[PDB]
Design a protein around this ligand. Structure first.
Ligand SMILES: Nc1ncnc2c1ncn2[C@@H]1O[C@H](COP(=O)(O)OP(=O)(O)O)[C@@H](O)[C@H]1O
Ligand SMILES: [Mg+2]
Length: 309
């Protein structure tokens, strides 16, 4: 239950101008942060399921690639989805640590993130299915959560509000749910999505997929369904606006350790009630700046990820 990894990125323009010295090191699954003031102060140590070293470039033999990331976490999380269970992955961290590049990624030199890959993989396993008793259905929803109003990142309007249907549970009223029938088609929705995103990387991006599996039982001749709810999330840069963000992340924290009465405590948390916990495995990638100038925020992140256990 619950899976946590951290990923340090390469220096960015800012850090580079700031000569920002690297204060992060990694040894398997142990990211050690060094304090700036005290170059000695022995690097502080933490230990996760995964500690990806992406400080260099796709060149360095020892570089955690978007594939590696997806193959370790995504891949499995997708597998469980086929088994019939809900799945949710989370990107969390300072703005610019790497959440988006990790979830979505890019295109050239195929730097596709977890979402693009996971998708391609989901459809690849479906099309190669050679049992006529198995038919599939993939419904997608994409959105943004700001000041706790849901923005349909793949549509116009009608601000949306998340209710709590009697039995069914949480849901965003009037939120588009499009059935796709191929990777490409699901890829357009992605591009259109990250395209609509303008805003200010201050809101949570929730890419949900409702994977349905229909099995035609040779005997009895009864088609039974099996529904999985995959929710890939790009959280806010942790670091009124702050109120909803802080409350969200917080509520989320006292859950991972728990999952391994806090809930309606916030929309984001009140929405993934079917993914946050109850059951079904979740995962959490933590973007980390390798720059000294971010010591406090970088450290705070680590602690947040360390508490998720
Ligand atoms: N592991 C990485 N490999 C390559 N570039 C990265 C990596 N992590 C971050 N970056 C760079 O940093 C920038 C910001 O990452 P991003 O995920 O978009 O920010 P945020 O934390 O605000 O979501 C990108 O424009 C990208 O080039
Ligand atoms: Mg952005």
């Amino acid at each position: 239950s619950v899976k946590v990894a951290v990923r340090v990125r390469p220096f960015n323009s800012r850090e580079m101008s700031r000569d920002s010295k690297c204060i992060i090191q990694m040894s398997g699954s142990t990211t050690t942060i060094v304090n700036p003031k005290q170059p000695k102060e022995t690097p502080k140590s933490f230990s996760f399921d995964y500690s990806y070293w992406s400080h260099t470039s796709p060149e360095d033999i020892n570089y955690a690639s978007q594939k590696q990331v997806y193959r370790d976490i995504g891949e499995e999380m997708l597998q469980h989805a086929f088994e019939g269970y809900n799945v949710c992955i989370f990107a969390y961290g300072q703005t610019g640590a790497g959440k988006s590049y990790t979830m979505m990624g890019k295109q050239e030199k195929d730097q596709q993130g977890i979402i693009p890959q996971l998708c391609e993989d989901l459809f690849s396993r479906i099309n190669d299915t050679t049992n006529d008793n198995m038919s599939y259905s993939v419904e997608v929803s994409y959105m943004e959560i700001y000041c706790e109003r849901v923005r349909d990142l793949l549509n116009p309007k009608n601000n949306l509000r998340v209710r709590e249907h009697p039995l069914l549970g949480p849901y965003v009223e009037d939120l588009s749910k499009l059935a796709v029938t191929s990777y490409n088609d699901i890829q357009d929705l992605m591009d259109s999505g990250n395209k609509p995103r303008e805003t200010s990387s201050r809101s949570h991006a929730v890419f949900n997929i409702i994977f349905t599996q229909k099995r035609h039982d040779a005997e009895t001749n009864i088609t039974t369904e099996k529904v999985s709810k995959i929710s890939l999330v790009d959280l806010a840069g942790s670091e009124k606006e702050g109120a909803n963000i802080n409350k969200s992340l917080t509520t989320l924290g006292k859950v991972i350790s728990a999952l391994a009465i806090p809930y309606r405590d916030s929309v984001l948390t009140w929405l993934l009630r079917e993914n946050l916990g109850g059951n079904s495995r979740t995962a959490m990638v933590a973007a980390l700046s390798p720059a000294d100038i971010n010591y406090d925020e970088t450290l705070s992140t680590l602690r947040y990820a360390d508490r998720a256990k």
